Design an enzyme around this catalytic site. Structure first.
Site, PDB file in Angstrom:
ATOM      1  N   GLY A  30       4.557  -1.580   2.541  1.00 23.00           N
ATOM      2  CA  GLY A  30       3.939  -0.197   2.326  1.00 23.00           C
ATOM      3  C   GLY A  30       4.769   1.165   2.239  1.00 23.00           C
ATOM      4  N   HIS A  42       0.909  -1.246  -0.201  1.00 28.40           N
ATOM      5  CA  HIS A  42       0.218  -0.071   0.015  1.00 28.40           C
ATOM      6  C   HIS A  42       0.907   1.198   0.077  1.00 28.40           C
ATOM      7  CE1 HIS A  42       0.732   0.817   4.379  1.00 28.40           C
ATOM      8  NE2 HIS A  42       0.541  -0.276   4.435  1.00 28.40           N
ATOM      9  N   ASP A  43       0.489   2.339  -0.721  1.00 29.61           N
ATOM     10  CA  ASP A  43       1.035   3.531  -0.911  1.00 29.61           C
ATOM     11  C   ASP A  43       2.557   3.674  -1.311  1.00 29.61           C
ATOM     12  OD1 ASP A  43      -1.433   5.040   0.335  1.00 29.61           O
ATOM     13  OD2 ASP A  43      -0.626   3.548   2.118  1.00 29.61           O
TER      14      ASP A  43
HETATM   15  C1  S2N Z   1      12.416  -5.883   6.937  1.00 28.93           C
HETATM   16  C2  S2N Z   1      11.198  -5.189   6.266  1.00 28.93           C
HETATM   17  C3  S2N Z   1      10.378  -6.216   5.370  1.00 28.93           C
HETATM   18  C4  S2N Z   1       9.399  -5.946   4.531  1.00 28.93           C
HETATM   19  C5  S2N Z   1       8.237  -6.877   4.235  1.00 28.93           C
HETATM   20  C6  S2N Z   1       7.192  -6.434   3.240  1.00 28.93           C
HETATM   21  C7  S2N Z   1       6.127  -7.334   3.405  1.00 28.93           C
HETATM   22  C8  S2N Z   1       4.973  -6.631   2.582  1.00 28.93           C
HETATM   23  C9  S2N Z   1       3.782  -5.988   3.680  1.00 28.93           C
HETATM   24  C10 S2N Z   1       3.067  -4.983   3.124  1.00 28.93           C
HETATM   25  O1  S2N Z   1       1.919  -5.282   1.959  1.00 28.93           O
HETATM   26  C11 S2N Z   1       2.343  -4.397   4.438  1.00 28.93           C
HETATM   27  C12 S2N Z   1       3.240  -3.789   5.374  1.00 28.93           C
HETATM   28  O2  S2N Z   1       3.869  -2.812   5.211  1.00 28.93           O
HETATM   29  S1  S2N Z   1       3.317  -4.608   7.070  1.00 28.93           S
HETATM   30  C13 S2N Z   1       4.778  -4.371   7.359  1.00 28.93           C
HETATM   31  C14 S2N Z   1       6.130  -4.940   7.013  1.00 28.93           C
HETATM   32  N1  S2N Z   1       7.217  -4.852   7.726  1.00 28.93           N
HETATM   33  C15 S2N Z   1       8.150  -5.728   8.597  1.00 28.93           C
HETATM   34  O3  S2N Z   1       7.468  -6.696   8.886  1.00 28.93           O
HETATM   35  C16 S2N Z   1       9.507  -5.030   9.030  1.00 28.93           C
HETATM   36  C17 S2N Z   1       9.264  -5.164  10.631  1.00 28.93           C
HETATM   37  N2  S2N Z   1       7.934  -4.381  10.904  1.00 28.93           N
HETATM   38  C18 S2N Z   1       7.972  -3.176  11.588  1.00 28.93           C
HETATM   39  O4  S2N Z   1       6.881  -2.957  12.260  1.00 28.93           O
HETATM   40  C19 S2N Z   1       9.123  -2.387  11.426  1.00 28.93           C
HETATM   41  O5  S2N Z   1      10.173  -3.059  10.417  1.00 28.93           O
HETATM   42  C20 S2N Z   1      10.012  -2.181  12.810  1.00 28.93           C
HETATM   43  C21 S2N Z   1       9.263  -0.747  13.263  1.00 28.93           C
HETATM   44  C22 S2N Z   1       9.584  -3.204  13.610  1.00 28.93           C
HETATM   45  C23 S2N Z   1      11.402  -1.945  12.422  1.00 28.93           C
HETATM   46  O6  S2N Z   1      11.943  -0.956  13.330  1.00 28.93           O
HETATM   47  P1  S2N Z   1      12.816   0.407  12.815  1.00 28.93           P
HETATM   48  O7  S2N Z   1      11.734   1.183  12.019  1.00 28.93           O
HETATM   49  O8  S2N Z   1      13.306   1.341  13.963  1.00 28.93           O
HETATM   50  O9  S2N Z   1      13.876  -0.094  11.787  1.00 28.93           O
HETATM   51  C24 S2N Z   1      15.331  -0.533  12.588  1.00 28.93           C
END
Ligand code: S2N
Ligand code: S2N
Ligand code: S2N
Lengths: 259, 259, 259
Positions: B138, B120-121
């Site tokens: 996203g 998304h976005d």
């Molecule tokens: C390493 C990134 C892996 C990216 C996975 C992409 C999967 C596609 C999911 C999207 O269709 C919807 C989202 O966007 S669902 C958010 C998915 N992101 C995560 O699973 C990363 C950990 N998820 C988090 O919440 C942040 O990564 C953190 C805030 C935990 C990391 O902390 P930080 O920003 O201080 O960096 C050091």
């Protein structure tokens, strides 16, 4: 509610009258689907599927497909058990169990993102998130409120503790401890999952008591066996710390190496 | 041109007369598809999709599906904006935006390989390549001519600069700088993407001037803040180097650690 | 046997009378499918597909789709050659070749797990396992009895030797040597694939002779070129060790770095 003209549903499948089934979806015999569940197009629900209330199945999701197990006898009547308020995103893939009394079990309010995979005989509690492209091998166990990031692979027979985080692309070969974050290839326990604990609304006292436990375990220059003994001999523990100790003692593969 | 008998297209969808739609594909209302676009079987085009000219959608590709965002209100009319001459391969997955004025944007001449995912976005320029199984979270931004290899995961809110390379299985948590190669878990900037610059036909003088910039930034024993100041005080820079400086200054998450 | 009413099969496709084709599957012209092959719903078999006996194609599997190659001329009649007793799991993706005399070749008794991918012009022997989500680039060669774990990416022009193991999430950029295990990002040869050799039923003498070869190669403080010379000058070798030497000598990209 409405089942699409082109949907192929076995006459023996038992669907609450509120169940919606979209275009070109296939529902086999020996299937039950409870109130308020919505199935979109090109979805496949296989024999053995027991499906709870208010679930959603997005386009192309496949539920209860044959185990990816060379030795499994495909004539066996095995099951996939799914609770309430689960979301299965597009082309997500859930495999049924390998024995009569051994189903694949999914609890309630779980989120399975697009292309995510749950292998034969996995057991999953409540409110877990399986991010895009992530794969659980057969016999993987998740507790409640675990977060598995994108393109993670979890080895068979591992346990993922309550309120844990697994980072993007981590290769998990041993247990993921509760309240903790695991990352890398090779993966390690990086520290506490404070983000998961705070969002959950753990009191500062509980969060500090979980911190203390892992301080003893991982940050006191002593073996894990000695550490667990130390914690038990310290006094009346909170449920969460009792759970940490049990999770370590009952581990089959062991707990992931700390960073 | 020809739309297949079994294709389910909402009467309100606006399709140029040249548009081809294959077997068992589903096109919803609030969709526009311009001249020369071809859609093959089992493809889903969701409400909000604005599709340009001469695009191709291979079997099972899903366009404008609901955001994988727990807090997103599914009653909202959000959009997926796609330009011209894009190729979406089999079971590729593109998510729509999360606000009215915040669509998912894809420019022109991009290639989305099988099983690739755009969250998304996301915002994507021109001539980018998303390799098999790669996932953008996203709010990921790609410039022009970026190459994302197979099974890469890109963290939300990262920027991927023009003419960059991300290697197979890299875990990207911070920005990918322009003209550069990023690799690993944890990922690092390995060096310049000379292959991308040469194929693009950058003059040797431009390539050397990009080299010089990153020599100052990464190979001169000085902080990145001091480095950027040094480059500005050096004289009239070429557009590409001006762009490098801006990309570093405007970074939200920071730029990936150098190897 | 039975072909489903809604299945779309070109009149020119040649299917043995025993072939089963499930709901909403699409079979194009210039396709041959031999005795006992079963195709389930939403499966696509593209022009150029030559399919042997007793294969299975699970829901949504796509066979012989266009190469993910920007320079490939899509007007060309290229082929996908598949042997006997192969299993293609759900949404597995097999690409056809890029030249008339250059097909994608799959032997017999191979297992392609859900979401697995075989790129244009790959060559694959017998009894190989491609685990969930794993991707082979174009021009990847597998021998016999190789095991590729989940979410592995294999670089183009690499060779994977007989009876090898590639661990979960490994990034393979160079050859995987026979009888060996490769792991990591960056990946390394970790050691012998004793599990694969024992299950295969290699005698203890053959297993020890394979051990000895790699002891000389990797554990004797000498270059690989000197090591191979040493082994040849040692005496009459067993077929397996002769094969190791040849695999090293004929390598195009080189053999993966040892741990
Ligand atoms: C390493 C990134 C892996 C990216 C996975 C992409 C999967 C596609 C999911 C999207 O269709 C919807 C989202 O966007 S669902 C958010 C998915 N992101 C995560 O699973 C990363 C950990 N998820 C988090 O919440 C942040 O990564 C953190 C805030 C935990 C990391 O902390 P930080 O920003 O201080 O960096 C050091
Ligand atoms: C790193 C784990 C990657 C997980 C991949 C999940 C793909 C989904 C497959 C499932 O739908 C069916 C299986 O469950 S198929 C078994 C898949 N597992 C592997 O590919 C790991 C190597 N496979 C193995 O056999 C064990 O991993 C080893 C015994 C080789 C490791 O040895 P180990 O247990 O001593 O650990 C150090
Ligand atoms: C680490 C390899 C990851 C493999 C991804 C498999 C995805 C399936 C794509 C195929 O269905 C079509 C292709 O075959 S599309 C080529 C995909 N390959 C890459 O994304 C690797 C970087 N791509 C490259 O061009 C070469 O990897 C490089 C020449 C950049 C590496 O340089 P190098 O050969 O000197 O090695 C050190």
């Amino acid at each position: 509610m409405k089942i699409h003209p082109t949907a192929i549903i076995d006459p023996k499948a038992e669907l609450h009258e509120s169940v919606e089934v979209g275009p070109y979806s296939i529902i086999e015999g020996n299937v039950s689907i409870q109130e308020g569940t919505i199935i979109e197009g090109h979805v496949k629900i296989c024999a053995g599927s027991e499906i709870g209330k208010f679930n959603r199945f997005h386009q192309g999701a496949v539920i209860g497909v044959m185990p990816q197990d060379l030795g499994f006898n495909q004539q066996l009547l095995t099951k996939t058990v799914i609770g309430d308020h689960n979301i299965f995103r597009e082309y997500s893939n859930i495999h049924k169990g390998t024995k009569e009394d051994s189903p694949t079990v999914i609890g309630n309010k779980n989120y399975f993102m697009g292309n995510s995979h749950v292998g034969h005989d996995c057991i999953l509690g409540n409110n877990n998130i399986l991010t895009h492209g992530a794969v659980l091998a057969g016999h993987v166990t998740l507790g409640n409120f675990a977060f598995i990031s994108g393109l993670v692979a979890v080895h068979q027979f591992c346990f993922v503790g309550d309120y844990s985080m697994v980072a993007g692309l981590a290769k998990v070969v041993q247990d993921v401890p509760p309240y903790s974050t695991v990352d890398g290839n090779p993966s390690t326990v990086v520290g506490l999952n404070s983000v998961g604990m705070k969002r959950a609304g753990f009191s500062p006292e509980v969060r500090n008591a979980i911190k203390h436990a892992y301080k003893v375990i991982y940050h006191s220059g002593i073996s894990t066996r000695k550490a667990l003994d130390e914690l038990e001999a310290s006094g009346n523990l909170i449920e969460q710390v009792k759970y940490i100790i049990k999770f370590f003692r009952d581990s089959d593969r062991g707990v992931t190496n700390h960073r």
